[PDB]
Amino acid sequence: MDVLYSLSKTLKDARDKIVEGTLYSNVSDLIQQFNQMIITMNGNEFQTGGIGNLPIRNWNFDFGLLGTTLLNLDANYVETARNTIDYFVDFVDNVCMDEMVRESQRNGIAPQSDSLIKLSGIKFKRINFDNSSEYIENWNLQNRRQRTGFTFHKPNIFPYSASFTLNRSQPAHDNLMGTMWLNAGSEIQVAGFDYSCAINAPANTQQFEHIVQLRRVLTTATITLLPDAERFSFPRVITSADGATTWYFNPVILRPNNVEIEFLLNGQIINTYQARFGTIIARNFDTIRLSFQLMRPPNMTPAVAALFPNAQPFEHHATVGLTLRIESAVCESVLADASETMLANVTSVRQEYAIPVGPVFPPGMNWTDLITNYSPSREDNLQRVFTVASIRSMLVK
Amino acid sequence: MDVLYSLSKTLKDARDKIVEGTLYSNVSDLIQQFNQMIITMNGNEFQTGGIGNLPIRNWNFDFGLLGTTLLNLDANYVETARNTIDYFVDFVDNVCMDEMVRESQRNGIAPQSDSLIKLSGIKFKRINFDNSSEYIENWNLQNRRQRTGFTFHKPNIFPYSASFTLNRSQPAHDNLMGTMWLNAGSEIQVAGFDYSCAINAPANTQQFEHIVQLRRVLTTATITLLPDAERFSFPRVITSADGATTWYFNPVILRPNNVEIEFLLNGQIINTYQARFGTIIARNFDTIRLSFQLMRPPNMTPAVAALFPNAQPFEHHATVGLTLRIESAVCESVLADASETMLANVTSVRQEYAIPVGPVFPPGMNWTDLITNYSPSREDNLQRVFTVASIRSMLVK
Amino acid sequence: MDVLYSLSKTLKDARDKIVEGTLYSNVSDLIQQFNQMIITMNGNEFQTGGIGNLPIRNWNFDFGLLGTTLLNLDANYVETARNTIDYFVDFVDNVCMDEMVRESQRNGIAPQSDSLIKLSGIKFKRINFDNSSEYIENWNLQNRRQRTGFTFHKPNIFPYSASFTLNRSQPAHDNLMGTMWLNAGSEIQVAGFDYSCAINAPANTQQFEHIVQLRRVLTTATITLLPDAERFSFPRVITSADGATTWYFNPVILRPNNVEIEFLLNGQIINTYQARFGTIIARNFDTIRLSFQLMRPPNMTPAVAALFPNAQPFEHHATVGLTLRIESAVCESVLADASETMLANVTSVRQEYAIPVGPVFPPGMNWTDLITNYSPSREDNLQRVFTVASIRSMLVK
Ligand SMILES: [Ca+2]
Ligand SMILES: [Ca+2]
Ligand SMILES: [Ca+2]
Ligand SMILES: [Ca+2]
Ligand SMILES: [Cl-]
Ligand SMILES: [Zn+2]
């Protein structure tokens, strides 16, 4: 993997650096590395493709070195360099694509592709240079078994699920207290509702909890908590848990009470925030538990009093909601995120060449399926593909 | 354009690299390039400005080289270097600003500015070095007619439009089925509504479609699909298509049914997703067609049954909605996006110097106007300004 | 601060660059800098920690140089290098953490930590190299008193506040016109409501204003304006300004009228946008004033007419709303933002070692408290911690 990165990294620098009219000193070190790459590559045959719709290509390297005598580079020098760069960029691109579409249950980390396997051989190690990328650096650390972290803006950590639970239920479905939620992407929305409005409830208060457990630990996250949920604040007709019938939800929205958010790792509270809205920091967590309460208003003006009356039927149902978004976090595992293009790159290559379903990855490379049962085997496989995708993007965007 | 980039790129590196107490070896290659820039620049006169409120400046270069003999740099060396760097940073800044405010219908790609025209002359080519930026690299590829892509987080691709269509209409405006939408930025929201609730409708089902066509093709995009639209879920009084009268919309929200999203390029479906929510990938597309259906509930509890009754008047109107956001994509054309600062930079310079309206660009450099009729002429002009803006930001943020 | 940056910067490059099998030419300049760092460091003792729960560590440097004779690096060379790199990475990490947790009212900019104070001494200046980071570059400019800017995606500029004002009020709280808002993060939402619907109002029109004043000036921002506010579009029971009673808000939503947004700096309008939605640019501002009007519909279909009737009670209350998000801006002061991880890093270190409350910073390092009274003293302190946090992230993520 490291060797493949360097081939790309060199080719990229060669493209940026070798420009007509530039001083030789600017590119002298680069010319040496580029040449060393040609010497190592030369005389080897590489075969890629033949899986799915991906064509089989044979790659042959027999190139001359670049000159080291000009003071400033010229159009001639640049043209010669380009021909070598082009053939090389194409090979790397293909080697990457071939890697991207494979997976192994037993040894996910090891390179699947024949071309990648050949490179990881001893002779080629010379090509290796300058592994400064966030993905390569992380790749290097993992082999040494050191700590690593990827930084995500809007981490994609919550598999999509929308649901509700009815804490008190009737067939009439006319006097219900339950929470409903959406967890999608980096955003959690939780709503607690009482049809009664807690007129019965001891202390006149109703207590709701949502607990969300993440697949992977997150560190140094930045999050926003907002009182209320926009999503669950409008009237809906809702299909039913059994699936038999449909209830009706009509809400009136009251400020949540006695809110707490707890961020827990192994069930020790690490961070706890009470009645705090806006940006908050959770340093380390694997679970979030949100607690909020519905409190009946002790004093009501006349219009309010009409809304909540002492016995059914109740027209308007009291709801309290929270919204939590993780803006950025750090993970020790790769995840899809808003900014990065890796899931998109891997998914697209697989889609285009009609790769058949593979044991390691859910069909279509669906994120929700993948994040839902994100096993160690999947994690190994995901990183190897992601790194190659990153490598590929250096050259082919 | 390439020469201008290097002037900037050198000046930037000179600022980062030439610091007091540093080893000469660290900056030796840089000193050579910096000096070469001084030799090339020296003896030339450049004139900029005089368009709008932008002042006319005359630029004269007569500077000595930097020394190459110290072991570690010192306060003296740094002070001398700074004076040259300052004059140079100012010139570049101005040359850029002068470029930013001009445009041509006939030859948008070619540099408009007198200063930029002079630089693109043969002698100056020597200054050229190290074109590694995403904007410069893309600039280089386009001249060679190779494939290019810019990567956007939250691409700004949908011109702002909010509208509705009434599929069934009455002057009473009391029994209406129609879709309403918002397309803004990277976000599409579509809502389908039936006042009847489809009690009449064949199969008890009502089918809605929204088709959105983008101005430019997008590749390897990451998108979120969420059932329901928050925007169209609350009651509104709406002005009317003729503009004569106003209707009333009151919605009750039901899960959309038989949802499909299709991503099409030249009217071949490239990607199709059915009943899938959360993150999905569209590898290549120029059109999105969203299809969803409204299905009357076969079974209704008593409160639900009250909501939809067999003949008018109907108090509550059934609605089904979708939300689609493109988190990140790749385009072969420049676009405004959430992260980048180029539209802001170009627009601000034009605003500040009171540049008169130009044929190529809509007045005020408005994005919606620009994206709405994003012609080849505009695209050429947009990139040249954007690259200069990027160049300028290296030095002047 | 500059010296600390370089120690880190060197160590980072040493980790990326010194890899087995690489050509010596690739790392020769680096080896020279790395060695120079060892020579400067050697023979000095540094003590860190002892504040809060942070352990006291003693640091001793006595290391040999790296060899300069191999053609390509080998496993041996790499292993030797790593041992030096490790001890060094640990020290830097600790020096940073020690810096992060301190603050001074009197001299915020100067380094608080004993280790940092020792480094800023004359002998160590030699280590200094290559200050190219956005944070370090900004640090350098500020000392020279030059202009600086940080670029934020989703700047965190509005302290969280949710409120309302009642322009016309009754104890009944049954005929009210008032605005309500949320300002959180980079997002401003404003809603104007009339229970009457302006049937009384002169010209049949009702005019609302929201004025928001930011703590720091912002330049070249990109913003989205959307008609309507999702947040205030659903019915709520609201506690009351006195806190005594609760009113009831039920809204019907009408398009805002005669919208203007003004961006002002020192109370001169810099940018003014009328009836413009979608992306707009504000080049320079310290205040936003949003103006919108509620206009009674001259023509109403029968269902609409029912909604607004001539005398109380009024069931449905007319509302008009605006949403404004700043996607990206530039500030001359550091701010928390969606992408960056600095507030999270500083906050987490303080949380973990149980640092006692400090005079400069609000307890818990809360952003809303900090942004609300963002004094010059806080700003000085915030930057020094932020730069160290950035430095630390180079090495320890
Ligand atoms: Ca765990
Ligand atoms: Ca309602
Ligand atoms: Ca097309
Ligand atoms: Ca000011
Ligand atoms: Cl975002
Ligand atoms: Zn973002």
CB C279 within 8 A of CB B344: no
Nearest to B343 among C222, C224, C284 (CB): C222
CB B293 within 8 A of CB B205: yes
Helices (H), A101-234: 114-119, 134-143
CB B184 within 8 A of CB B273: no
* Strand segments (E) across chain A: 45-48, 57-60, 150-153, 158-168, 177-185, 187-194, 205-227, 236-239, 246-249, 251-253, 257-264, 269-274, 278-295, 317-331
Residue (of A387, A110, A389, A144) closest to C20 by Cα position = A144
B271 vs B228: CA distance, rounded Å: 21
A316 vs A319: CA distance, rounded Å: 9
Helices (H), chain C: 2-17, 24-41, 75-100, 114-119, 134-143, 302-307, 342-352, 367-372, 376-395
**What tokens does A363 get?**
């069909």
The enclosing domain of A174 has a CATH number of 2.60.120.170
C61 vs C84: CA distance, rounded Å: 10
The backbone torsions φ and ψ at residue B269, rounded to the nearest 5 degrees and listed phi first, read -70, 130
List the 333-362 stretch of A: residues with Cβ below 8 A of B: 336, 338-341, 343-345, 347-348, 351-352
CB B362 within 8 A of CB B370: yes
Ligand approaching nearest to the C-alpha of A215: 1
| Residues listed for chain C | 397
- Going by DSSP bridges, is the β-strand pair B251-253/B317-331 parallel, antiparallel, or unpaired? parallel
Sign, Cα dihedral of C387, A327, C286, B386: positive
- β-partners of residue B60 are B45
Q: For residue B290, what are the contacts with CB-CB under 8 A and spacing of at least 6?
A: B188, B190, B209, B210, B211, B212, B259, B260, B261, B262, B322, B324
Domain-ending residue, one of B294, B328, B362: B328
Residues A312 and A180 in one domain: yes
Residue (of B372, B365, B330) closest to B154 by Cα position = B330
Residues A261 and A175 in one domain: yes
Domain-ending residue, one of C284, C306, C328: C328
Residues B89 and B199 in one domain: no
Chains touching A (at least 3 CB pairs under 8 A) are: B, C
Q: Does B22 touch chain C (CB under 8 A)?
A: yes
C295 vs C303: CA distance, rounded Å: 18
Residues B287 and B214 in one domain: yes
Burial class (CB in 10 A: 0-12, 13-18, 19+), A195: buried
Q: Across the interface, do A283 and C239 touch by the CB < 8 Å criterion?
A: no
Chains touching C (at least 3 CB pairs under 8 A) are: A, B
Straight-line distance from the first to the last Cα atom of chain B, in angstroms, rounded to the nearest whole number:
20
**Ligand 1 mean position, distance from CA A286 (Å):** 6
Q: Across the interface, do A222 and C172 touch by the CB < 8 Å criterion?
A: no
DSSP structural state of residue C158: E
Residues A149 and A200 in one domain: no
The H or E element containing residue C159 is: strand C158-168
The interaxial angle of helices C376-395 and C2-17, nearest 10 deg, is 20
Nearest to A174 among B2, B252, B303 (CB): B303
C378 vs C358: CA distance, rounded Å: 11
Q: In angstroms, what is the resolution?
A: 2.6
Chain B's closest residue to A389, CA to CA, is: B220
**Ligand 1 mean position, distance from CA A270 (Å):** 13
**How much helix, strand and coil, in percent to the nearest 5, is found in chain C?**
35, 30, 35
* DSSP reduced 3-state for A81: helix
C132 vs C138: CA distance, rounded Å: 10
List the 175-234 stretch of C: residues with Cβ below 8 A of A: 182, 184-185, 230-231, 234
Experimental technique behind these coordinates: cryo-EM
**Ligand 3 mean position, distance from CA B217 (Å):** 6
Residues A19 and A148 in one domain: yes
- Identify the domain containing residue A350 by its residue range: 1-158+329-397
Nearest to C343 among A131, A222, A301 (CB): A222
Domain-ending residue, one of B296, B328, B360: B328
DSSP structural state of residue C356: P
Residues B352 and B284 in one domain: no
Q: What CA–CA distances, in Å, run from C64 to A368, C18, C42, C76, C84?
A: 52, 16, 9, 15, 9
- Going by DSSP bridges, is the β-strand pair A251-253/A317-331 parallel, antiparallel, or unpaired? parallel
C62 vs A122: CA distance, rounded Å: 35
Residues B322 and B381 in one domain: no
Question: What's the alpha-carbon Rg for chain B, to the nearest Å?
Answer: 29
Residues C31 and C125 in one domain: yes
**Ligand 1 mean position, distance from CA A266 (Å):** 6
Residues B167 and B66 in one domain: no
The enclosing domain of A7 has a CATH number of 1.10.1350.10
CB A357 within 8 A of CB B235: no
Burial class (CB in 10 A: 0-12, 13-18, 19+), B317: buried
CB B261 within 8 A of CB B273: yes
Nearest to B19 among C128, C227, C271 (CB): C128
Largest CA distance in chain B: 95
Burial class (CB in 10 A: 0-12, 13-18, 19+), C166: middle
Q: Does A120 touch chain C (CB under 8 A)?
A: no
Number of domains in chain A: 2
Q: Which residue has the tokens 């669950």?
A: A232
**Counting runs of H as helices and runs of E as strands, what totals does chain A give?**
9, 14
**What tokens does A349 get?**
């290559």
Residues A208 and A352 in one domain: no
- β-partners of residue A273 are A261
Q: Across the interface, do B347 and C281 touch by the CB < 8 Å criterion?
A: yes
- Going by DSSP bridges, is the β-strand pair B45-48/A278-295 parallel, antiparallel, or unpaired? unpaired
Q: What CA–CA distances, in Å, run from C76 to C16, C68, C337?
A: 17, 13, 44
Residues C320 and C203 in one domain: yes
Query: Is A286 labelled as part of a ligand binding site?
Result: yes
**Ligand 1 mean position, distance from CA A331 (Å):** 12
Q: Which long-range contacts (CB under 8 A, 24 or more apart) does A77-85 make?
A: A77/A18, A77/A20, A78/A18, A78/A19, A78/A20, A81/A14, A81/A18, A84/A38, A85/A11, A85/A14, A85/A15
Chain A's closest residue to B251, CA to CA, is: A235
Residue (of B249, B182, B179) closest to B208 by Cα position = B179
A185 vs B68: CA distance, rounded Å: 55
Task: Give the 3-state secondary structure of C241-304.
Answer: CCCCCEEEECEEECCCEEEEEEEECCCCEEEEEECCCEEEEEEEEEEEEEEEEEECCCCCCHHH
The H or E element containing residue B135 is: helix B134-143
* Amino acid identity, position B49: G
Task: Quote the Cα angle for C208-C158-B337, to 5°.
Answer: 95
Query: Is B266 labelled as part of a ligand binding site?
Result: yes
